[PDB]
Amino acid sequence: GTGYDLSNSVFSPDGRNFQVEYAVKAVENGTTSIGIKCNDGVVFAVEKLITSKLLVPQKNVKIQVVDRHIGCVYSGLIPDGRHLVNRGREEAASFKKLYKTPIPIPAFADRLGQYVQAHTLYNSVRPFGVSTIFGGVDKNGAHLYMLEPSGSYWGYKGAATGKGRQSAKAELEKLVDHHPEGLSAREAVKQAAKIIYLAHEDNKEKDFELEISWCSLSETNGLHKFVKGDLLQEAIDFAQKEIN
Amino acid sequence: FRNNYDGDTVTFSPTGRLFQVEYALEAIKQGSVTVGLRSNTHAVLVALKRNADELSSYQKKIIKCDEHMGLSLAGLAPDARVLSNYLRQQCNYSSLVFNRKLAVERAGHLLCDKAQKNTQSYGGRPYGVGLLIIGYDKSGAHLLEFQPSGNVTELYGTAIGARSQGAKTYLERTLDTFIKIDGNPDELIKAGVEAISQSLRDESLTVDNLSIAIVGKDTPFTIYDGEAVAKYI
Amino acid sequence: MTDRYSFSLTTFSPSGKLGQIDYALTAVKQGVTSLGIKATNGVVIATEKKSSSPLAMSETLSKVSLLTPDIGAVYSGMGPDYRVLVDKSRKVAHTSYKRIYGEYPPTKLLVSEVAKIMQEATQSGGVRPFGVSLLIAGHDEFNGFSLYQVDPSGSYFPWKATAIGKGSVAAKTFLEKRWNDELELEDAIHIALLTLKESVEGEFNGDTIELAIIGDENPDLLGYTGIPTDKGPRFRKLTSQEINDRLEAL
Amino acid sequence: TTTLAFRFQGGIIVAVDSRATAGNWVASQTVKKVIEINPFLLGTMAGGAADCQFWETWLGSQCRLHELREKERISVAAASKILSNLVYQYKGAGLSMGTMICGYTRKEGPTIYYVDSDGTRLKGDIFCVGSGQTFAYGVLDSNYKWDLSVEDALYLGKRSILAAAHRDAYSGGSVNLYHVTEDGWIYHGNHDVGELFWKVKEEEGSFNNVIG
Amino acid sequence: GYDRALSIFSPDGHIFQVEYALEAVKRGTCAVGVKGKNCVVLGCERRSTLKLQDTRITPSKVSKIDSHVVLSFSGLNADSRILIEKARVEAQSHRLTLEDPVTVEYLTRYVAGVQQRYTQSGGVRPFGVSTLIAGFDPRDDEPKLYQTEPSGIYSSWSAQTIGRNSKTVREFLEKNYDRKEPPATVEECVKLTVRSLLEVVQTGAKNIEITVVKPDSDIVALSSEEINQYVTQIEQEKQEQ
Amino acid sequence: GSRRYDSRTTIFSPEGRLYQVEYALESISHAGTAIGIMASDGIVLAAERKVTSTLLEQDTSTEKLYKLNDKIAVAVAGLTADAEILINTARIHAQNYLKTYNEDIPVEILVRRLSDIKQGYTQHGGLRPFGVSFIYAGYDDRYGYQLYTSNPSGNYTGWKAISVGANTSAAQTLLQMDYKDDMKVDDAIELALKTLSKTTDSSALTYDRLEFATIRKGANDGEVYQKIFKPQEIKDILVKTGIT
Amino acid sequence: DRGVSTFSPEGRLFQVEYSLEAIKLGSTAIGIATKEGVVLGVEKRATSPLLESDSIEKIVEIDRHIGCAMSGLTADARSMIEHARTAAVTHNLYYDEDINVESLTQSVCDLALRFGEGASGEERLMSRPFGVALLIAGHDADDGYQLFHAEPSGTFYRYNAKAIGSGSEGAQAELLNEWHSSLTLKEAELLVLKILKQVMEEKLDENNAQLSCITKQDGFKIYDNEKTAELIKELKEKEAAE
Amino acid sequence: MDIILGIRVQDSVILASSKAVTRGISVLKDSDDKTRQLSPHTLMSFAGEAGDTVQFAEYIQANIQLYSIREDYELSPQAVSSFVRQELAKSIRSRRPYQVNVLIGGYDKKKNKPELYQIDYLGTKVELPYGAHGYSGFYTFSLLDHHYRPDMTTEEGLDLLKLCVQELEKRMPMDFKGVIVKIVDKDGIRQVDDFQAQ
Ligand SMILES: */C1=C\C(=O)NCCCC[C@H](NC(=O)[C@@H](NC(=O)N[C@H](C(=O)O)C(C)C)C(C)C)C(=O)N[C@H]1C(C)C
């Protein structure tokens, strides 16, 4: 029959979970955001649409940090995004408290992964309306990760999600090809600003605000930090220049 | 279509929408207009109080949460009481435990997370009220716009409620002007009354009809009603 | 989260039927045949090991199970449901009897216990009945040997012999013809193998058939000596080789 | 502390002292050991201050609620059982209160109930409770008659507390009188033991031992 | 675990589950109560869909909550038990804590509350029962008669009836009972009740049971004969005309 | 959520009826007939075994007559499984009454408890009622021989003669036609069998399709006795009453 | 079905709205406040002549300075009244003072939205909203005489005069004209007694109508029949007077 | 302790109980009735801890009356006592046990015989011709052990009690202020108001 899309834990006859699929819709509809894994860290950037001149500039920050070494950015239902990060924070804290060592990016990934997958198991809950790009540096290098409402996630060299997800994925792939030896944290910040500016064409209607953050072993001592001031403008420029 | 995906908040529509949440957002539009705007020294709230008969009172739209924070509501009164009351506790807890004033930005993050919880669990319902929180903290004056969806945003000014679009455009225009109204509360207030009259239609703001609130540098959040607002009409 | 299914999933229809229990029985009908025969000095139960792939090893799966050392069970219906039912039936035997009286429960009661479990899956909130019917056979000092059939409804009854599953009607008829109140265990075993052959399409041997008995005490199967009153289990599953030998005298 | 309540023809007489201590240290001579539960109910207070004062005030609230509910003045016997039962819920916990619940309902007439943190609830005509009870009993017992003028009963009471205040180190301060009639209780002033003693001595000629 | 809101509001502002509860009452046997000048009487009809019962044991229609108070009902029996129990238990609790038996009005207000509660509590359906509670307040002689319904509402009546054909008998009573001069006698009071039941009982000597309550816990239920007699004397009243 | 699959087994019909109780009864109407007759010197319980076979081990069977106490027993009609669940709690209740008062539980008291348990599944819980109806046959020193009946609704009543299960209407008419207050156990025993005989949906009323029980006070003793006839005992009484 | 706490696409709560309907069907209740006191009046509405009209209680006392009138499903009012009484008495126990009439009202209003089948915000156990509205009248030293309207919505207003129940919309219209800042208590009494007579299907008499009031001096009192009757008689004469 | 005596004669059970209520140094009351009627033909006398004493008695009463109404029947004395024992027996292993001892005297309307039950806070129950709780036992059991006969009339029984009360006043330390006597029989429970000089 039909109606296999009214409850969250139901399998359609072809083996799907429409509710989860409908969630992905809420995501694709959201702003665009990316992650670039450089050779000793990860860079995060996001598209911040300026709905009006009323929004205090530089104020409604999107990228979130978990603990001190992990960075999170997501596209879709922001509130769901935060909800997830809160859980990640508790999740990371619980971990450190028992094992002392700050939670390894991979372990954290599956920590968020199992939680999210958990919301595709019961009809009493709604799946997450967000895709999340997150990562950081740990005992063995840097890691970039993307998590889907389905709970699925994998390690990426580059990742993008949202409205301009394709333009991005397009650009990210170009990078991967023209840099087999790796990209530097400094360079990834620039390239990210560009890739965000390009992906902004599928929303060229409203003006936006760029927001980059990175976690580099050599640049930030393995700590997640927001790219501000000079280095920021410098990237905004490197992008503004190549958009013409 | 929509009829099969709006029976509760734990259901997504084939397009990624959460109707029950949207229906809640509607209750706000059906609500009486209220305006918020701030300079660098003060933040202000102006709200239109709506009454039932002419034998009834006008319902309060502004609520104080602390000596440095407060807000205006549009929508389900009860829900504002619940949310404001919860925002009072948070300010309270911030003091009692850290001897620290709860930053406006954080109060917002708190509201957002509280709201969000009523939009992913069976049995719960979203809050049918919009809020405009103003406050003065360690980083200055602030204005927040709270939506039942959970979306909280910091702006220089804004409005919500029926015909709110009027005032909002007016502020969006007056921006560069009121944002510089420092060291002068009365000026920031008049700019606030103007923005709000931009959403009038039915009548004109009277003394037992207008409601104003202000917080700032050396100004504890204080609400003005009746005779007190007379000097602005 | 939280099982919000605090209401019955099995209810009365205007006709007075209990849907799920009926459907559950239908599920039993579809399952492989299995039967039980009570002789004057033992009981036998058997079914067919319907290997669901030539690559799968049918030994690593028993349709015939020991509940206590003097009670065995066999089913027809949904294998997985039976599995958990066995574990439950083995535990309940301890928790509600051996731990209180220091002796294994008598057949009727253990059966009574399992029945209750199923009965509950017919009324409890948020669950479906068990898709299996059981044939339990055992022996106890004050009741001798006995054979019982337990249904997804939670009902059970004693039998001199009977069968359930696929060709039950056929086999049930064949048993009414061959059973008498003077059968020795070996007799029933024979009749069992015959009654089984009918429901068997392809191969019929000790590797495709699974049969056990509840006869005399096997002290050789006790594992230890030195205690007069402990004589060994009456339950014993036949070996593949033991089955084939009998099949020649078929 | 000394508190006493007795029933007689004119109704009920209630008198108490007003001294509060913490060991040998006199904390106060101005305590109100009589709690006016309501225009018709009185509660004496002996034992732990807080314990009596708190729980008796609470009793007032329960009595008020009972009348809102039943649209009728609560009975003395019921009021006394409420305290009684509440107190028993805390048996063994350490509450310390010996109290009297006195009232006048058209149904029961003059009534007095003795209630202590032990769970003991008793109805009677005379009750003396407190570290000075025996002294009060001494005087009272030997001069009580159901036929006392509301004036003489008032005196006998005032005098019974005077005795206790004198002999007992833990009693004193001042006397507080109350007269219980169906129309309710009528306060009868605060009499400072300081000045009351002498006056009584002279006028009555008793306390002949003391020198003055 | 189960807390489904079964009694909710519908567009027209009704709570159908409570309304349907009433329908269950309408289908129940008839029960009537009339207060005299010094007594109250309760009468109830006995169904006849099957007759071969053992009237000795079979639960009767009028129950004693306490020695001075009784309660009769119309509706689902299974449900009446639950109410009668709670009432009886509260009857003792009130004595134990207030050292005084419950007033007829109070016991009523309690029962009504239970019912009301069941109309706005999760996972439960309202009581398909309506009650008649009568007796005499402690140390009082003015008879009491109250009635409650699934909605949780209650009130006092000089006389009243509930159940099937209660419409009919109520009429009978509305034009046969004068508040000015209430049945000044236990006898003339029971007669008025038997009369009122006959309007619907359709000759049922063994189908009509009467219970008389007087001040100071004087409760008694008449036998078939005492009743049969009343029916007798009444049938003549008709013929003698 | 879950509300989507909730049958709401405990609600009223617009007519003020209880759906499930009604339907449950509907189910019971198809169950083997059980009859209870009460004579001056004893009570009789006769029931018809639903579904039987040549192979059915009849000596070891019981599907309708259950012993609850030493002076109380019941005849069932409906889901045996359900019946048991209730019978066991009944057996316990009897014992507790004994343990508390050191006296045998009064028949009606046991019957009221059982009925109350049923009534419950009728007013709250969201579960289905028990598809059972009981004919209680017992004796105590307060009301002597008693006969009661209870069903899914939770209501119970007393009888001189009564039946439950299938063709009750037919049986009730036959009983109502030949019952007399001054009957004797033997008489009742006959009337019982005669009735079944005339209502049986089967060919002939043979012993292998019956369950019989009598509560008599064996004069040569002074105590009451419960006798649940064995296959042969039924086969005999069956020939005697002239049904061979 | 559909959640008991579901939103309509218009931004309203179904159950709450439907709740308001059941109330329109309720008995008429009117309240008028004057600088001399507040008057509360209600329609008994006996569903039969055998029903002892005085056992009809639709005007109750919350405290000595706070009373109220109810309309709609009145059985629902019991738990609210109990709550109100307790809150008022408790406040007195905790603060040694009377509770403000507004807070008393605000307190009642807080129970209102406490319903659902699992609403994420606390433990709201009550399957449906209340099917009754309340007119809370009283006095305190902070805002003098006050009249409040509390609906199952969870909100409440303060009226100089307000009428709820079947005859409301019309009666309220009447009050819109009749009421003025200088009415006397006596005036408000007849006015209530008048508007009641208009909207009542029944011929208003001292047995199907009931008056009461709250004055700083004597508190909440319910006019005994005799007192009401005379007031009625008085009303008739002044009416027939022109 | 207080004085709780019970003696079962031919057709009735007589219960005697001290009227004194002493708290520490002062005797607060001299007319205390340490008894509760459980039903028209069952009377229970009690003595023990200050609060527990009545709390337990009333509780038992409530429950017995509730059973009376529910069953419109009066439980036999034997049954009533079994209920009581159970209750105490539970109590003893609870968080805070009832420290009460009781005598239960009733007339079994069915057997038509009077009965006396003695039960202590431990739930120890025994049926006796005569019994007492506390110290009284030490002075009275020998008296009764001596002057007791099963066929004694109610009057003889009273005299026998009179004998016990005297010994108790003679040899006991405490002033128990006399006793209140009550008789339970076929016609119910009644109090011998003239024993202060009978
Ligand atoms: C009556 C005297 C009496 O009956 N007994 C003598 C005992 C003194 C009790 C009481 N004194 C007080 O209540 C003290 N405060 C405390 O005792 N506080 C205690 C503490 O701090 O350890 C706590 C644990 C209760 C005074 C300072 C309030 C007393 O004076 N009783 C009088 C009468 C009732 C006022």
Side-chain angles (χ1 to χ4, degrees), chain D residues 1-2 17-23 25 27-28 31 33 45-52 96 129-132 168 170-171:
Chain D
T1 294
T2 293
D17 75 283
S18 64
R19 178 175 292 176
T21 40
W25 164 261
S28 179
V31 183
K33 304 185 189 185
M45 171 196 289
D51 286 356
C52 285
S96 180
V129 178
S131 52
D168 186 13
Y170 295 132
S171 308

Side-chain angles (χ1 to χ4, degrees), chain C residues 1 44 135 220 247:
Chain C
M1 203 266 268
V44 52
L135 282 195
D220 50 304
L247 284 180

Side-chain angles (χ1 to χ4, degrees), chain F residues 144-159:
Chain F
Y145 291 111
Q146 298 164 67
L147 202 62
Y148 291 98
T149 211
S150 78
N151 58 68
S153 78
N155 191 185
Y156 73 95
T157 65
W159 307 85

